[PDB]
Design an enzyme around this catalytic site. Sequence first.
Site, PDB file in Angstrom:
ATOM      1  N   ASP A  51       0.843  -1.192   0.000  1.00 21.26           N
ATOM      2  CA  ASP A  51       0.000   0.000   0.000  1.00 21.26           C
ATOM      3  C   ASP A  51       0.880   1.244   0.000  1.00 21.26           C
ATOM      4  O   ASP A  51       2.096   1.154  -0.187  1.00 21.26           O
ATOM      5  CB  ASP A  51      -0.963  -0.015   1.183  1.00 21.26           C
ATOM      6  CG  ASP A  51      -0.248  -0.083   2.516  1.00 21.26           C
ATOM      7  OD1 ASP A  51       0.698   0.714   2.718  1.00 21.26           O
ATOM      8  OD2 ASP A  51      -0.638  -0.932   3.352  1.00 21.26           O
ATOM      9  N   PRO A  92     -14.652 -23.745   5.944  1.00 21.00           N
ATOM     10  CA  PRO A  92     -14.764 -22.305   6.146  1.00 21.00           C
ATOM     11  C   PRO A  92     -14.173 -21.928   7.497  1.00 21.00           C
ATOM     12  O   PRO A  92     -14.131 -22.744   8.435  1.00 21.00           O
ATOM     13  CB  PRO A  92     -16.279 -22.064   6.137  1.00 21.00           C
ATOM     14  CG  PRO A  92     -16.889 -23.348   6.513  1.00 21.00           C
ATOM     15  CD  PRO A  92     -15.964 -24.417   5.968  1.00 21.00           C
ATOM     16  N   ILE A  93     -13.662 -20.719   7.557  1.00 18.87           N
ATOM     17  CA  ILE A  93     -13.137 -20.097   8.736  1.00 18.87           C
ATOM     18  C   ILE A  93     -14.208 -19.794   9.776  1.00 18.87           C
ATOM     19  O   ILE A  93     -15.310 -19.449   9.434  1.00 18.87           O
ATOM     20  CB  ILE A  93     -12.376 -18.831   8.351  1.00 18.87           C
ATOM     21  CG1 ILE A  93     -11.584 -18.293   9.525  1.00 18.87           C
ATOM     22  CG2 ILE A  93     -13.263 -17.763   7.733  1.00 18.87           C
ATOM     23  CD1 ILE A  93     -10.496 -19.241   9.904  1.00 18.87           C
ATOM     24  N   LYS A 125     -15.414 -31.755  14.618  1.00 17.08           N
ATOM     25  CA  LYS A 125     -15.966 -30.958  13.523  1.00 17.08           C
ATOM     26  C   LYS A 125     -15.135 -29.715  13.194  1.00 17.08           C
ATOM     27  O   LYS A 125     -15.537 -28.899  12.365  1.00 17.08           O
ATOM     28  CB  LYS A 125     -17.389 -30.515  13.863  1.00 17.08           C
ATOM     29  CG  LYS A 125     -18.232 -31.572  14.554  1.00 17.08           C
ATOM     30  CD  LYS A 125     -19.539 -30.969  15.052  1.00 17.08           C
ATOM     31  CE  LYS A 125     -20.157 -31.796  16.168  1.00 17.08           C
ATOM     32  NZ  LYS A 125     -21.332 -31.101  16.760  1.00 17.08           N
TER      33      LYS A 125
END
Lengths: 121, 123, 121, 123
Positions: free
Chosen positions: C13, C53-54, C83
């Site tokens: 950036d 997924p997070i 899980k």
Amino acid sequence: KVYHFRVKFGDTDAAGIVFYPNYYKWMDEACHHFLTELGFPTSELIDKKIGFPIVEATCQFKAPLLFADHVFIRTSIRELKDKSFILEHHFIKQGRVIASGHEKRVWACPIPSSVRVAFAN
Amino acid sequence: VYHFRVKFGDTDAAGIVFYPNYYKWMDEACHHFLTELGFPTSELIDKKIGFPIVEATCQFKAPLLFADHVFIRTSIRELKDKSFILEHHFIKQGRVIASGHEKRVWANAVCPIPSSVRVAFAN
Amino acid sequence: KVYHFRVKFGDTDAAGIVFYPNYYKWMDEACHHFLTELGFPTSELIDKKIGFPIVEATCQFKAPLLFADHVFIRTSIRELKDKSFILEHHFIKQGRVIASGHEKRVWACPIPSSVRVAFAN
Amino acid sequence: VYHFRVKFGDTDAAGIVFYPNYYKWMDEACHHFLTELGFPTSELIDKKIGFPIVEATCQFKAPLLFADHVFIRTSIRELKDKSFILEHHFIKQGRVIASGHEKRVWANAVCPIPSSVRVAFAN
């Protein structure tokens, strides 16, 4: 010159293929790679406050890229003026061109001789 | 509060938003936060002044989807001489669907939060 | 496991270092690499409508990344439930850890046996 | 018109905006365009209907900088049975600082632009 990359999961969108603006990110990456491999590691050039900013880019898309595809870009210099030049970029997946385009970029001032000499291979 | 909409390009193949975008949005909330306090961060970057992240955490409860309208609630919660923590809560449909924080410091070379900013955080 | 990458120009950036959210993109990339190298090319898993997924991510930043840096991530599995599981990720530039973090991810249902067996190395 | 602000994260080390972002913004303008015409694109994606790009071009006149307020003017300019072109003009400070277009088709498997969309483009 050739630049290899893999489509990352993050490069895809909800339609299940690549989000197209990423094709310009890979062209920019290929551009830096090109200059580097040809003797001018751009990281140094950047630290000198000196660049080759874009003035025009275009890309045409023949077939989608997907998550995990291995791809490479064949890059070359097509026109080459005093203060600007064009890089053509060809996206090959498995022998096939799946997209192609170019970037007209300029120096920032004219292109340096070490650079010109380099482009005349 | 910092409002924003999920762009198509913020999604991925799984049909939902790619996760770091949540960090992108916190970064945006942070900047929007300092600006509304009276310190336009474009002005600081120009002057080579920043508030670099040292640590960041996010906890995802429910999915964001393409075109979702969202806003972030930012509060400041651990102000010290040289660092501060922003809490960010993502609100969708009136509910919190993710929440995190950023630990940030002040730099120019780390340095003390400016006095004007300090007082603005302390109010 | 190890995942190598180079900082691209686009990853930086205006402050002249990496835009921090990219560290989570590299963790996600490392996650896919980890699963792949350990026998489950994620591209297939994704096409089955199945993911990891997070639910939580964190990262702590010790030293900046710059354009052109070569870096790699040492990744490992730290907790491992029925899980869900955690991946620790360590960013090493030149022998040194410049940042570190983790992702708590879940299956989508419990983790598959072929997967469990794989994690118990 | 589609309004937007340059985020810090849209910039790069050279102090100015990374270029593809201009394509990201055109993609966003395109979606905002179809939605305001009455066809919420989130609805289409859900139904697995899209308007994939076949070609895109942008011409950069002046730099965008962090925090710039910008808007894009989108017009439709080459409507055919199966494709259309959107022209996008970036306006900053009342001036055009970049302009491009997207050639797009309609897909589900390419197919004809829907009749309702066709009529909406033809007005």
